[PDB]
């Protein structure tokens, strides 16, 4: 997928103003709450019995930072993405056995997080850019599958 100059702008503009700390666990928490079957992969994290327990879980917030980070590496490699996520594509495929369908879900939840943080600033034009990015990352991880 190819990105226009206006699209690279919208993505990089927001990445600059966001809480990389707290926003990671926010996304992972929502994934586990809205799409319950995903808790099967994070069974080892401990207490995932309630929305409060999940969001309060220390290991969810920690892993959240890691996920958010790998998204920043994507913005840095917009022209050539596939080569950057080959390490994670193998990890999630052969090592974890996660269906690619779930990568799209995390991407959507990602877009919803940005909407709650930026409100009116997260315009339809800005959203279109992020959807395009999210779709590219999802299909980069599905190389093995």
């Amino acid at each position: 997928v190819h990105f226009t100059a206006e699209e690279k702008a919208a993505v990089t503009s927001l990445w600059s103003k966001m809480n990389v700390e707290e926003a990671g666990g926010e996304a992972l928490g929502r994934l586990l709450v809205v799409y319950p079957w995903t808790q099967r992969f994070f069974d080892s994290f401990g207490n995932l019995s309630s929305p409060s327990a999940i969001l309060g879980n220390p290991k969810v917030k920690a892993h959240g930072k890691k996920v958010l980070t790998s998204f920043g590496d994507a913005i840095k490699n917009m022209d050539n993405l596939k080569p950057a996520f080959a390490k994670l594509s193998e990890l999630h495929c052969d090592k974890l056995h996660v269906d690619p369908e779930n990568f799209k879900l995390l991407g959507n939840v990602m877009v919803i997080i940005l909407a709650t943080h930026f409100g009116k600033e997260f315009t339809p034009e800005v959203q279109a850019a992020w959807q395009k990015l999210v779709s590219a990352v999802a299909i980069a991880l599905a190389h093995k599958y």
Partner: protein, 141 residues
């Protein structure tokens, strides 16, 4: 299937939307057309430009239909039988499109009511919208 908790969240959340239901419906559509342009092929008769009167008007129609589904959350098949005929029978809308509209609707609610859009509410609305979509994509008459 919706749990009693889902029904409570959906009712409580839609109440907070209130008067702006029409303004939100218009925006969800504007976002969908922008983020997923292939959905534009379903509205050839529409002037899809920036602040179209048709789009803002259809947003109200879509919003009222949803307000109606919340009231009849226990009898959706019977209450939406007319819309099911339109979308499934006459128009023949591909179900994947419902997922796209549901997403843009959630995104819109998240931007205007970030405080109220808790993970718990998000989860219940996602399920609710999924039920509505199932009904509108099925031929059951």
């Amino acid at each position: 299937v919706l749990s009693p908790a889902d029904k409570t969240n959906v009712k409580a959340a839609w109440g907070k939307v209130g008067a702006h239901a029409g303004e939100y419906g218009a925006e969800a559509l504007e976002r969908m057309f922008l983020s997923f342009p292939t959905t534009k092929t379903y509205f050839p008769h529409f002037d899809l430009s920036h602040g179209s009167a048709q789009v803002k008007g259809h947003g109200k129609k879509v919003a009222d239909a949803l307000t109606n589904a919340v009231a009849h959350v226990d009898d959706m098949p019977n209450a939406l039988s007319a819309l099911s005929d339109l979308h499934a029978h006459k128009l023949r809308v591909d179900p994947v499109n419902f997922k796209l509209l549901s997403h843009c609707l959630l995104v819109t609610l998240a931007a205007h009511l970030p405080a109220e859009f808790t993970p718990a509410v998000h989860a219940s609305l996602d399920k609710f919208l999924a039920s509505v979509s199932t009904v509108l994509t099925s031929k059951y008459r």
